[PDB]
Amino acid sequence: GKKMMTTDGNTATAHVAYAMSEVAAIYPITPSSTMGEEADDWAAQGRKNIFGQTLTIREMQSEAGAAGAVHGALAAGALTTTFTASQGLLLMIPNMYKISGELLPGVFHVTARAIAAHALSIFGDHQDIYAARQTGFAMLASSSVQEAHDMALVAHLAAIESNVPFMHFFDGFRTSHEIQKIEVLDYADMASLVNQKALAEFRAKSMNPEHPHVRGTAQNPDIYFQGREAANPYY
Amino acid sequence: GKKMMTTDGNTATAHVAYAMSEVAAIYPITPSSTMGEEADDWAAQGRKNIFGQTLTIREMQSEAGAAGAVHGALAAGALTTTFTASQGLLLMIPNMYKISGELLPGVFHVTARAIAAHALSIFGDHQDIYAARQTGFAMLASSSVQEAHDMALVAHLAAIESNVPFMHFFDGFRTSHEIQKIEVLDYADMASLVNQKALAEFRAKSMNPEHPHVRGTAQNPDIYFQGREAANPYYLKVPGIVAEYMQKVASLTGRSYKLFDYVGAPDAERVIVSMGSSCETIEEVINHLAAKGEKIGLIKVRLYRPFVSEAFFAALPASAKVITVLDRTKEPGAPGDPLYLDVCSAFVERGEAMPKILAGRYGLGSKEFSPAMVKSVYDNMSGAKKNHFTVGIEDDVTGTSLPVDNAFADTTPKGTIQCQFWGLGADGTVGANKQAIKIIGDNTDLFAQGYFSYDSKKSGGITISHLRFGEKPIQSTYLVNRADYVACHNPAYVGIYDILEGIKDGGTFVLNSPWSSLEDMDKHLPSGIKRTIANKKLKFYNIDAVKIATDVGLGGRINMIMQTAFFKLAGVLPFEKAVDLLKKSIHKAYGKKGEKIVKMNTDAVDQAVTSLQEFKYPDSWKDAPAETKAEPMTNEFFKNVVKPILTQQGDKLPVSAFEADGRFPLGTSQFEKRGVAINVPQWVPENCIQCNQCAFVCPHSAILPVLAKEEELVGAPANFTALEAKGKELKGYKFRIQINTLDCMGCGNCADICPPKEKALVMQPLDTQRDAQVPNLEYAARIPVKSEVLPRDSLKGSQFQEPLMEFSGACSGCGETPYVRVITQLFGERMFIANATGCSSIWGASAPSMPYKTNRLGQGPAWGNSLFEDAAEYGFGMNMSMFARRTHLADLAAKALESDASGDVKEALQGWLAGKNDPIKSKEYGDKLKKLLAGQKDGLLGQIAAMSDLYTKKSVWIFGGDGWAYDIGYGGLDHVLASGEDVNVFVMDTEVYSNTGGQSSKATPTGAVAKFAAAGKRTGKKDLARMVMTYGYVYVATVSMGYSKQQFLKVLKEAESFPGPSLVIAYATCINQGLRKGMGKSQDVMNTAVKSGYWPLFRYDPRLAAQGKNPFQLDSKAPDGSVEEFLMAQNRFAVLDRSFPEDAKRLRAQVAHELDVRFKELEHMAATNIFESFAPAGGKADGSVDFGEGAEFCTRDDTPMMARPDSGEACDQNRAGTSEQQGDLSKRTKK
Amino acid sequence: GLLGQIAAMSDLYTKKSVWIFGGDGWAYDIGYGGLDHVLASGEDVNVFVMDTEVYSNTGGQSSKATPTGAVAKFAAAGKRTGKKDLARMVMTYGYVYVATVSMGYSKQQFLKVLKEAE
Amino acid sequence: DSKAPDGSVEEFLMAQNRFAVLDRSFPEDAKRLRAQVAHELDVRFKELEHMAATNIFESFAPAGGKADGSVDFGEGAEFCTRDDTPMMARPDSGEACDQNRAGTSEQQGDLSKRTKK
Amino acid sequence: KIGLIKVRLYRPFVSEAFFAALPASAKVITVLDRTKEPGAPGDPLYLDVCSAFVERGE
């Protein structure tokens, strides 16, 4: 069922992202750090996701490391998420082109924060999400703490069904750190919305030496353009 | 002054960048590498910039380290530059925001190249530059080689005066590698335009402790937005600064530019807006069509950022009714591509006339953008007016493409001669064409262009050269499609490629072949070529170039003969002048080792001119009958996709032929059978000792050891000689070494290594072996591989296993591939491979050729290339999935044990759970579960049954070269090994970045010559192995196949079975190292690298320490004194000895000292009793604790950064002193 | 002329001391590949690492510099891998000056290190 | 510059919450982990002790030489040092060379000696 | 007489869904961006909304 709770945007979204993922690769960066920390706490504590399992979470050396790990977990058929922002999100850009280019159901939760230009700022704006608008991720904004729970959940459900990765984002500090009384969904309600066939087909197409494929080929001018437009139907 | 020069776009822009910069931080990436390499050559040659100094250049570990260095040099008051592209530009983005944020005069020169998404491409488009459009750099595009020079100069000048950094860009390959005759300015001329006041103010505002400031502050919400908008006035002045420098440069060159320039009919009704090399081709087509009355035009964009609408409108005819904006990129899901969106915003802002605006996409990954395509775009604006289209592809899935009519007329200027040359790699064809462009350009008033198309095949590849010569400027930024002259320099191509496609009626065709007679020519020339030669009235010429070169002593080398054919027959120069200039150059270049080599060559020309007579073909050719198709059985995939791509037809494949995510099946290489070897090994069974060493060493899997029982040999050909197998385990078995003569690359390692002094393998010409060995290979391939007879990890038994990586596009003799092939014979059926970009990804997966394959059971390596920098992290990620999913399976198995599942099912589940991390037990029990739960679709057992591809323990491998492991990917490599998880890392150390062209890496050794270490590297090789042995819990080993196949196999087994991280570093020989006797000596060189002590072999095994034994074990011996001959037998060391003998002797001496000290260190290591103990894991359990729980003082500060949902409780913040000072004070005050 | 150019470069006359400062999250993790490269270059730069054995500013996250058994974020039941030995990795080059300090142990050893390193 | 471990590690660790909080919540794991730390430092110090006792050392030179002049790694090589790809193509590449498809120097020589004519 | 269009799905940007939310009476619209792209002819959401209107052709 539904349940009331007073919480911030970061934890309203972590609530959903924990439920909907099997793997998370993390790296600290303000104001998104709370999500990774809550997920790691909850994992250490035995909380179960919609599969009855605890999240497999590891901290990398950088957000570039984190995005590469996310890419590999997705490519090998695990539902995966990450939490980031700002300079951290810019380091994930190269792997975001690969993750969308490979039609993988990844979900990035970002606390939109300013990029360091004349000065650094830990504070909220869309400079960082707009820097990734051409990577091919779908981008879904939440404008309030309550919307952060709901859109997190839509982005996870939509990524599994569409095989297009999503970036769910909400304002750094102004939503991530505002506390409100909202309603959240139990994990069993979330599980009931998953497209089980789309999930089973994501596992079946993933990397496995029992039924292998080659991904990440290098292409000449003869076929690269055709190859890039082949995803159109998915978008 | 002004100087004429035939160069490419990379070198036209480095010319300027060297002049205008004091510092350059560099990193190699195709197609920009050339610029950094020329800057280094010029700095070593003694070239001075405008300050009279040599450029200060340093190579970093990645483009991120390059951008950070550029930032610091700029902040510290030096004019700095960098050269990059694609993935590399993306790594610079974070620092681009800082460089522009701090208003520093930096200039980046980028060769615009595709970003890797469904696939990697090194080819040209604007996907990279547009990803950086919001960084705040000014963005100035050049559209031709000449413009690359001119815009590079405006960019530097404008950068210095405006304090806004510039990105100058030009198309990857289509402009960067096109060669053109252009004009360049002297450095003194460039210097004279520099704003000396602005340069002085740049120096005075820079970082310096004698007048310091603080830069890079952190700002709250109170002031950040004001701070961000304080640079607006600088951004408002840049367009005018650019415009002014365009006029000043023009006053020196006579080449005028505007922010946006217009070309075409002044009253045009249909206008294209475009940027980069496409503009040249569009202009060419406009000149053609507008003279016919078409009301068309083009707006060229030069300054893309800042985007000035008033300058765009200054270029737009008022009569324009329709406008199509072309973008060279794809932003999936956006409402339009960037240029189109900028143009729409100009018209909405204007708020007046709205002339129909269409968006079109073209040229991704250097796809041709030809005149017929431009015609289509203009035809669309008068016809259908299709919006958001694509051009250059057939999009049968979403219907976005425009139909292209290739019957369109040739639009090159009157007078232009267009030539195509079909070459076979290393035949010297490309070299001769380049020399021919130099000779003609330098001795005539003609404009000259060359562009070369290369294969992805590294050896025996096909090259096609596209040359144009004209009296008018050559704007033809597309391949030649209607040639005047076509030359086929390799006879074997005649029956495989469409050599004469597009040749003009009555054009000339020269063939290199020995088919001098009409009976010879009638036997080898396809009926299709006779058809065309006769129906098009071509001037056909046949020359037996190999015969002429052998006769005059040029040893069979045909380049000078074919060069003579061009000069004599291509019509760009009259006979006497051409033949004169040719002979003049054989003096200019050459004269190196005597007048014998100059005479060798001049005679070749003389005989060639004599022999170059028209071939007289009968009329019957006009109707030569079609042939048959002795085509072999292939795949539905090889037939419908790969063969078409291999035969240069990939462009015709519609979007519906490809998977949306870019995947390819395994095993497509099985059908290539290229047969490009000159010589191949012949087996001599009477000498064969049956060791299987030859098959173990082959870099292409071209040796198949056959082990058959007599009944399997019943349907074999008579010459299928087999021996009786030696060995106990083998007995009624027949043994045969079968050569694969069409997949052999002719390196010679196998016969070099064949143990018997009376060799069992002898190199012979291909042609003497194919007719017997091809059918033998085809029969041998149907014989079952006897993988169960000998231990899989034994030398001989390893070669009775199925190799799962065969026939790759690696070079003949490559020192990487032998290793990966045997790794697949040991673990291929259960492996995951995260491959770094490098040679290994290029020979590993260049479409359409896939060398990894499945076994007979359909099992084989799941292989992926993510990026160059993240391979260890991508591999780690695959491990994390396997951890989570196999843990989920274990959890279900435990649940099923507490259910009413049958006893058989519970027994298997119990055995599976007990051995799930064991390869043998998890497959044993998983195979029982596969049987027992077959068909099960409901409940728990149904869930377990659908996870059967997870039952057998997987083996995650991370493969990559030394540039990856020691430089760009080191940080991620080190983190992943420190993780303690079960992944296996195999580094092919070629001691250089090989694929990109031989640049120095931190793995390059002292004294080795490489790009960026052109006087011999002056820092020793980084000791990755000893750095990672400091962890204590990582298995580390070094291997060298030529030294011991035995130690290699042992290392593979020990590394893979280690239940923690493993690192294995292999010595890999490469063409870039210049092996003097040939790559066929690679195994011997690998042996000597170990005997000399240069590459000592060892294994560090933490499970020995866990049992109180020393984990360090030395597997090779003390240096034997042969280093010097090891070094001098490779050109990377020997070139230095020849040119800087003083330096070279000292550097080889240094290497001798380094290896001597490092062997002695490895010896005390193997003698120590002090060792870091081992524990795979154990502990943890359920529950967490925060570091701050129950602390006596606050553990978090008063900032927004440490604030958390549960923080804010009162605590002692250390402002009242220590616990003890506080209690003392209390005792002292009391009351 | 020449003398006016030289005079205009007076802020360059005294030899400068270039220092790179950062914490352990920087040096052991995210900026390690860059630090290793820069040290390997053999140029005259000085790096000073303030090891707090955690990412401090962000909230106390574990880094490769966190030791075994320490509680930190992402090491909520005590860190189960040992501290990375950055000092012994960089000593493998042989041409990099490497030193460790602890002010409360010895002020004198700290001052000698700074003089020798610089 | 410092001396052998004096035995106070336990006191040291337990004086800081980052270790003491583990001891209060997972006492069994904590006492193992604190003992592991004491082992690690014991072993590391012995390692630093033989380093300080060794006579096998990496010598030193700050720099010296180079000068003007450079050479390409493929200059004068007996066989091709570049492949047939677009990635190694350079302005001056394209000359004919032995691409390793006919075997080693000795193999081609011996083969010539077997054919002639 | 005022209103607001709240963007939820920024990418893929669907013009038909944006127009579904725009009142036929709107005479002036201001597109607010929470970013700055120095030198650009406008910020991203503004450019996207300009393209929806040019394409609509009304």
Ligand SMILES: CC(=O)c1sc(CCOP(=O)(O)OP(=O)(O)O)c(C)[n+]1Cc1cnc(C)nc1N
């Ligand atoms: C194909 C391409 O884009 C590769 S090929 C690789 C050369 C690899 O060297 P290594 O020693 O690791 O491997 P080797 O070739 O076996 O010697 C480089 C430098 N890159 C260029 C490059 C540069 N920088 C970044 C971020 N991405 C890429 N892809």
Ligand code: SF4
């Ligand atoms: S290496 Fe020589 S002796 Fe050994 S199996 Fe091969 S052909 Fe026979």
Ligand code: SF4
């Ligand atoms: S010559 Fe080279 S490619 Fe051919 S079979 Fe021998 S080792 Fe393999």
Ligand code: SF4
């Ligand atoms: S590693 Fe060297 S020999 Fe092997 S494919 Fe690459 S360039 Fe060729």
Ligand SMILES: [Ca+2]
């Ligand atoms: Ca292992």
Ligand SMILES: [Mg+2]
């Ligand atoms: Mg390499």
Ligand SMILES: [Mg+2]
């Ligand atoms: Mg710290």
